[PDB]
Amino acid sequence: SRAVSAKKKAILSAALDTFSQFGFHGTRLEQIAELAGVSKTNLLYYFPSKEALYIAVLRQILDIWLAPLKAFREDFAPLAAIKEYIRLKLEVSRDYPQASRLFCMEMLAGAPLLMDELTGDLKALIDEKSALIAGWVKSGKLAPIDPQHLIFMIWASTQHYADFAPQVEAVTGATLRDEVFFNQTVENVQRIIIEGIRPRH
């Protein structure tokens, strides 16, 4: 149904903005229900608790973050695939900083509510894609870097510009919404990581 999806997205977006501004414990479901334009009973049909909504919000940003990596295939040009991956991750930092910070804040608390996804569906995908990239490496299409550590570096360097945005602005005077700085950021992150994993000699 389109209507169910339209409504689930209105709730998730209202939920993101409310968790972002009031934190998990200070947020009440009725407040989210007011801003999505729906009744509490209607909201609870799709998300039975504050915990369910919160987890769903973080699953949504994870699905966005991982889409490029889920699309990886063995016959891709490895360096080209990874440079596109880096570019998509920084567009997410520019456009969805609130969700990036919400995820980072969950990690800082020990991932009390997200540990089910990290040990389950997330670990399954990274195991699968790590084996794929290890194939690219055991075949000389990439230098020898270990796959899980290359992935962590991609995540860390692109999410930095959202999560650490106040420090980036303080040192450079710019943000990712400044077109020129955005393009300089993409090119420089790409240069270091790509040349760092490019086959040699």
Ligand X SMILES: O=c1cc[nH]c(=O)[nH]1
Which residues make up the interface to a second copy (CB under 8 A)?
Answer: 101, 104-105, 107-108, 110-111, 115, 118-119, 122-123, 126, 143-146, 148-150, 152-153, 155-157, 159-161, 163-168, 170-172, 184-185, 188-189, 191-197, 200
| Enclosing H/E stretch for 12 | helix 2-26
By CB atoms closer than 10 A (0-12, 13-18, 19+), residue 53 is: buried
Distances in whole angstroms, Cα of residue 63 to Cα of each of 12, 45, 92, 122, 198: 13, 22, 12, 10, 28
Using CB under 6 A, which of 16, 32, 38, 62 touches ligand X? 62
Distance CA 130, CA 99 (A): 25
**Only segment of 60-68, 76-84, 177-185, 186-194 that touches ligand X (CB under 6 A):** 60-68
In the bound complex, what is the minimum distance in angstroms from residue 151's beta carbon to ligand X? Answer: 8
Residue nearest to ligand X (CB): 65
Within 139-168, the residues that bind ligand X by CB under 6 A are 155, 159, 164, 167
The CA angle 128-164-80, to the nearest 5 degrees, is 40
Residues that bind ligand X (CB under 6 A): 62, 65-66, 155, 159, 164, 167
